[model samples]
Target: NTIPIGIALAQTSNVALLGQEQVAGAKIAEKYFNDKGGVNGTPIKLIFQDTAGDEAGTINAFQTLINKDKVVGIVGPTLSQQAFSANPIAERAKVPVVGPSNTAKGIPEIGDYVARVSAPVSVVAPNSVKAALKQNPNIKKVAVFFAQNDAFSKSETEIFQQTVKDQGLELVTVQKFQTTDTDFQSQATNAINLKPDLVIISGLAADGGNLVRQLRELGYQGAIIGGDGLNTSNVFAVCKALCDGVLIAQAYSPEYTGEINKAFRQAYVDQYKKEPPQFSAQAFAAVQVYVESLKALDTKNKVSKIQLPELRTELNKQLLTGKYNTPLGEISFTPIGEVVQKDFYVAQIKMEKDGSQGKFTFLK
Candidate 1:
């Protein structure tokens, strides 16, 4: 009566702040798509597996989702680090996998069966730097920091560094931290001592926001640029009022006016009472890809008529065969299953007076 889709994400760890938002988005998509007559009237079900916050946990989650739950496709393993560990399992098993938040380089190249809804750092990181440069035309020295242990941040830092150099800015210093580390005093102090005109951060919400807070508290207030990992509103809680004015690259902009985006944003606002962040919007889009592909398959032959293995195979084939008007804007995929998205944005955070709210104000 239903097709099961596996969702593996970091549901129970430091990464849960983002993973929880992903779960919200996926659940919303589950309901939104089902309400519209899912898979030609056959309902769809989502099977979830918690990947915690590490590679080992994600590998087991993928193994269980593919081998035990017998899902036709998968929608996550929130971190790119998790994707690096888990995607091969799905690929080898011939399960179609759509990464909801994995945006590091080489994600889609993990296999023909693996694709992503999130834009890669190569496309997303540089825009924020350009935006930063425009905001402070005199920026000449840049300092970069990233969580060395997380593959996504490590990958993102390289792009951030390259972008800084391409802008002809001096590469002042590169600092490393752990995603688990909360104290960024030394790194921030060191970067402060160097008197950088611009600071670029490539880390997840918690560490990245905390670093931003520490950097500000230590009285280094030049220009701050954060990579896509800081795109989440969850960073507001980490830095509160101090979250203001941090420019970050974004793959999904809540202000985007595409018809599909408008509807998705309305749907999200009704459910969550606020604009959707990139993580939520991207996860929603990933689910849309799978659901629509299944619906597309049903048009050729009843989806229920296909065998499970064949359905997964056909779903992977169907992924690139259609263009989707999603919350991320109209998007398709490359032959290698990388996302092809046209509209990207750079946003600066505007924290509310109460520190209870923050919004990513889209920039021109």
Candidate 2:
């Protein structure tokens, strides 16, 4: 049925930087669908809820969307930490959720109801290690820093550690901090004391950028690597000149030469005057999947009067086999609902002359 899909996002909280981008990207997809003559002519509607970056807020938002709003499916709660609390509610309600930016290791383990357009930390983090090696083969000793409270950061650090070991690199030191921390002086000092060849940080831009700045300011000359948490343009803004030469992995490239990729990149730049990040690209793809599933179901029967349960099952089935032309290129899902289009790239930070502003340049 042409059911109204709910898009949950963290509008006001620590994750809002990424959340707002996801919202913008998803809205693009919604507009694209309706422009293309939405789901058998019955336009898809997005019911949005502000998760607020808290567990209670996320849970309440999920319940409200499922009960009061009566949405057919949900898109996100943005952060992996929020998903840890909110996904259980959706699972119990049998409400299918497509995670747009939740990239923790065990997110899919929530239940059959939860799927992610975002790549897991395990899959995405290894690419950073490979990029580090490719850039500098002598990167032997590596130091790690991650946010303790962030599920995505924690999980990504684990992957980084594992990847470092697999590459036969020596583990110099490990550091941890809170997401809100702006001071990384102590951690930076400790890491530098180890004299590691490289530093890898896994956390949001808020903390990760501070750490990067501190590492560079403390006279650590080795290259810096970051997990997906630092993959945003916001990180470049935060680290400024300190972010120069920082290496990170990307799941989506603004320059990816696919039709959908070109369309999304152009649309985003036209509307927001900036390129969309991987998180935003994934959210757009999530909306595409939902809209496509509805269109596919509607092709067989009218969706407006179909039972929600049957509609949900059919949408899930369709999503499993559906191929979506997204900004990330052609996206398909595996049996377990993991995204099948797994291209990763390495990007470097280019600091401006003032050393307080920078831009990200993808590596060839």
Can you write out model 1's per-residue Cα lDDT over 57-174, one digit (the tens) per residue? Answer: 9999988988899899999989998898789988998999999879899999999899998889999889999998888899999999999999999999999999888888899899
TM-score of 2: 0.95
How far out, in Å, is residue 220 in model 2?
Answer: 1.6
The lDDT per prediction is 0.89, 0.84
For residue 321, give model 2's deviation from the true position in Å. 3.0
**Regions more than 4 Å wrong, model 2:** none
- Output the number of the lDDT-best candidate: 1
lDDT string, candidate 2, 1-364, tens digits: 3458898898887678668778888888888888888887888889998988778999988999999988889999888988999999988888889998788988878887888888787777788789878889988999999899988888989989999899999998889999889998988999999999989999987678878988988999997898777777777667787888888888889999988878888888899776777777888989888888878877886777678877777776777678887787778877777777757777887888787666678888
TM-score, each model?
0.97, 0.95
- Model 1: worst 10 consecutive residues (lDDT sum): 255-264
